[PDB]
Structure formats: C-alpha cells, structure tokens
Amino acid sequence: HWGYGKHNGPEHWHKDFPIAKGERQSPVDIDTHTAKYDPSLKPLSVSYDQATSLRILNNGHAFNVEFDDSQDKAVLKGGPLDGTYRLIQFHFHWGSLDGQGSEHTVDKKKYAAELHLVHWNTKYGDFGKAVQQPDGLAVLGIFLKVGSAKPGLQKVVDVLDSIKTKGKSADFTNFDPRGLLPESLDYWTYPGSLTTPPLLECVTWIVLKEPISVSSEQVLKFRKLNFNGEGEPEELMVDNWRPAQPLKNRQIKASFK
Numbered sequence: 001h002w003g004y005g006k007h008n009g010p011e012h013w014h015k016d017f018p019i020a021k022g023e024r025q026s027p028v029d030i031d032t033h034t035a036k037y038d039p040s041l042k043p044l045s046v047s048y049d050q051a052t053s054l055r056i057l058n059n060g061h062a063f064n065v066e067f068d069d070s071q072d073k074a075v076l077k078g079g080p081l082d083g084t085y086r087l088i089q090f091h092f093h094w095g096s097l098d099g100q101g102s103e104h105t106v107d108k109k110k111y112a113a114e115l116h117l118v119h120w121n122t123k124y125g126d127f128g129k130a131v132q133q134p135d136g137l138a139v140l141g142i143f144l145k146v147g148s149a150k151p152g153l154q155k156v157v158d159v160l161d162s163i164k165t166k167g168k169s170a171d172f173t174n175f176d177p178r179g180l181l182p183e184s185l186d187y188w189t190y191p192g193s194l195t196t197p198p199l200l201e202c203v204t205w206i207v208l209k210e211p212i213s214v215s216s217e218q219v220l221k222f223r224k225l226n227f228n229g230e231g232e233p234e235e236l237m238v239d240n241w242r243p244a245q246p247l248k249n250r251q252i253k254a255s256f257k
C-alpha cells in the first residue's frame with residue numbers, strides 16, 4: 001500500500017488514486033508575488049478555548065492528535081469560509097533534514113515541517129460525509145522552522161516515545177492547540193485536496209504566512225518515530241511529505257499585502 005518510499009511514494013499514488021492527477025491537488029507552491037491580495041477576505045476566527053483533545057495515534061504515515069468533534073468545542077470560521085468548521089485532528093509532515101519537510105512551499109522555499117489542523121464543515125454532519133464535498137474541509141497549515149523551541153509543542157514531543165510504531169495510541173487529554181499558533185493570522189488561501197491518499201478534492205486550504213519556530217531537539221524527536229509496526233523492520237518516519245503539485249486553473253488569494 002501507499003507510503004513515502006521509492007516503491008510506494010507520491011509518484012506511484014495515481015495508480016490506485018487517479019485523482020492524484022486532478023484539477024485541484026495539494027500541496028502547491030505559493031508564489032508570493034503572484035498571489036492576489038483580496039481585501040474582501042475576512043480575518044480568521046480561531047476558537048479553540050473549549051478544545052477537548054482525546055488521544056494521539058501513530059497511523060503509519062504521521063501521528064494524529066485527535067479531538068472530540070461531536071460538539072462545537074474547537075472551531076474555525078471566517079476567512080474564506082462560509083459556516084463553521086470543527087477541529088477533528090492535527091498532525092505534521094516533516095523531513096529527514098532541516099531543509100525539507102513542508103508540503104506547501106513559499107517561492108520554492110521548503111520549511112522543516114508543516115502542521116495541519118484539520119476541520120470539517122458542520123453542515124455535512126460528520127467527517128466522512130464532509131470529505132465527499134468540495135467545501136467539506138478546512139485545513140489550517142502552519143510552517144515550522146528550526147530555531148527556538150515552541151513551548152506549546154513540548155507535550156506532544158514528550159509523548160512520542162509511547163507511540164513509536166504504527167498502530168500505537170496513547171491518551172492525550174487537555175492539550176491546548178492554541179500553543180501551536182504563530183502571533184499573526186495573516187494567510188494565503190486556495191481550493192485543494194488532501195495531500196495523502198485518498199487525495200480527495202475537498203479542502204479549503206488556509207496557510208499562515210508566519211511560521212512557528214521549533215528546536216532542533218523537538219524535530220529530532222519527530223524523526224525517531226517509525227512508519228512500521230512493532231516487530232516489523234524499522235523504517236524511520238521521515239520525509240512524509242508530498243511535493244508541490246501543478247496549480248492548474250487556480251489563483252491563490254492573500255489576506256494581506
């Protein structure tokens with residue numbers, strides 16, 4: 001099955017997921033000079049004060065911190081969005097080296113990692129229904145650069161030893177995702193897709209302009225995770241990113257000039 005190796009990586013995905021060659025695939029390169037400032041774009045409204053984290057899971061492709069999405073506890077609204085999108089999980093994509101790891105790029109620049117806070121449109125009732133809709137998901141993407149530590153990331157880093165291998169999960173309650181945000185909520189936005197199979201074209205992407213900084217030790221700990229299950233040959237979970245895809249008939253909009 002699909003992964004990030006030479007034999008099952010992004011160049012192979014189209015054989016099982018033909019939408020890989022579709023009209024609104026993600027990620028993309030954000031060419032900052034050609035992105036269009038849209039003065040009609042509203043500020044983002046990130047309402048995470050009542051978030052209920054539940055668990056952290058290694059799914060063989062990344063690790064997901066999962067939330068209770070059975071009520072409007074942690075929601076995203078405003079920006080380019082109509083209606084209310086509920087936080088279901090966040091995860092990261094990262095590199096084997098500090099010079100790569102992000103999925104989106106900015107003027108071809110790669111960051112060390114990229115955080116995705118995944119939200120689904122509550123008019124569709126559940127996540128499974130939402131991914132079948134062109135406006136089903138909103139993913140808030142945040143770049144990570146290596147520099148100073150992100151204190152709000154440390155609780156995540158410290159639990160990774162308990163979910164080293166595929167299929168492992170751990171309780172992960174009372175985590176506050178507000179501690180993962182940068183200061184500014186300035187963003188770019190464009191219509192796209194899931195960046196992993198099934199590659200569904202259901203995502204309004206909202207990518208923050210300001211990266212967060214994490215420490216070398218924090219990202220090193222991501223790199224100690226495994227793609228494999230316990231007792232299978234060890235393969236480090238690194239370079240779990242899809243490269244930039246053609247923009248095709250899309251214009252990236254900016255909330256700022």
Ligand SMILES: NS(=O)(=O)c1cccc(F)c1
Pocket residue numbers: 116118139193194195196197198
């Ligand atoms: N990487 S991502 O597009 O945020 C993504 C991929 C697959 C499932 C999902 F909920 C989110």
Ligand SMILES: [Zn+2]
Pocket residue numbers: 091092093116195
């Ligand atoms: Zn992702």
